[PDB]
Write a protein that binds this ligand. Structure first.
Ligand SMILES: Cc1cccc(Cl)c1NC(=O)c1cnc(Nc2cccc(C(=O)N3CC[C@H](C(=O)O)C3)c2)s1
Length: 286
């Protein structure tokens, strides 16, 4: 896969600021030689064979894709150490943190547009035979045009690197069959997409609040589902609910999701009809 990747010389790359970090490398904002901003992920000397395969495997996978809603690879530094993966720079960072910092600042149409973009990237990945396994707002990046792009690619590194994945998966974003018998498919990614819809429409509320992982699994198995967000179009809540069908075959495909979201956006008055919100509090005044 790496034959598809541009090998970039280190003198073309300036790291400027740390924006992410782990035990074996960091992510930087930087510039790439007409200079352009880029994100730069490093792998420090001493890495194992498995770490090298996982790290360059992420770039190898990303280099196979060309889609507006999938993070673009610019190239790699593999002939010098530390090794680096260089991608486009998404100026607004991770979607979950972005929404929590911008609570209430977007229109419903803007939020639905973000979901359409995520769904288009996921339809592309699914049709390219790539199962994400860790779809969540924390793994979507947002640029200065409000474009949302799917990130976090690889094999075993995806669930290994995510702190939300517990002994190892991120339970409350994961479909039942993936938890119960390890069946990860594009239809389990659709379940996750339903969770991401709820994260977007709530401005980054944590799914299921303080329920424990066991309590979430028991609730889902008993037929409970997340309640409607505040100010959520009825069509959007119906769509996320259908993503959470227990029976995999009843879930929409991403092709259906993209189609529905595009129709709603193109007739935006459809989004003015809101699902009823069940208040958890009662305020009464004489
Ligand atoms: C997705 C991917 C896979 C492998 C290797 C790499 Cl280099 C990448 N690309 C990335 O991780 C990223 C691309 N764009 C990113 N943007 C980003 C991430 C986290 C925070 C921010 C952000 O909003 N910041 C605002 C304050 C600070 C700044 O102004 O740079 C950081 C931006 S991360």
């Amino acid at each position: 896969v790496l034959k598809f990747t541009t090998e970039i010389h280190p003198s073309c790359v300036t790291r400027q600021k740390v924006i992410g970090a782990g035990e074996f490398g960091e992510v930087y904002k930087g510039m790439l030689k007409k200079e352009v901003p880029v994100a730069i992920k490093t792998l420090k000397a001493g890495y194992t064979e498995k770490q090298r395969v996982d790290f360059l495997g992420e770039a190898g996978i990303m280099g196979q894709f060309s889609h507006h809603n999938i993070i673009r690879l610019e190239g790699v530094i593999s002939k010098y150490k530390p090794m680096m993966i260089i991608t486009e720079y998404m100026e607004n960072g991770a979607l979950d943190k972005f929404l929590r910092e911008k609570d209430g600042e977007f229109s419903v149409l803007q939020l639905v547009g973000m979901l359409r973009g995520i769904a288009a990237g996921m339809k592309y990945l699914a049709n390219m035979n790539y199962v994400h396994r860790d779809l969540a707002a924390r793994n979507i990046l947002v640029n200065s045009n409000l474009v949302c792009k799917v990130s976090d690619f690889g094999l075993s590194r995806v669930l290994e690197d995510d702190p939300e994945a517990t002994y190892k998966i991120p339970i409350r974003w994961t479909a039942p069959e993936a938890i119960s018998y390890r069946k990860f498919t594009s239809a389990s990614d659709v379940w996750s997409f339903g969770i991401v819809m709820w994260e977007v429409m709530t401005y980054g509320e944590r799914p299921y609040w303080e329920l424990s992982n066991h309590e979430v699994m028991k609730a889902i198995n008993d037929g409970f589902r997340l309640p409607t967000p505040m100010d959520c179009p009825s069509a959007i809540y119906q769509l996320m609910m259908q993503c959470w069908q227990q029976e995999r075959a009843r879930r929409p495909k991403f092709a259906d999701i993209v189609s529905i979201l595009d129709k709603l956006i193109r007739a935006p008055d459809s989004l003015k009809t809101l699902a009823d919100f069940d208040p958890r509090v009662s305020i009464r005044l004489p």
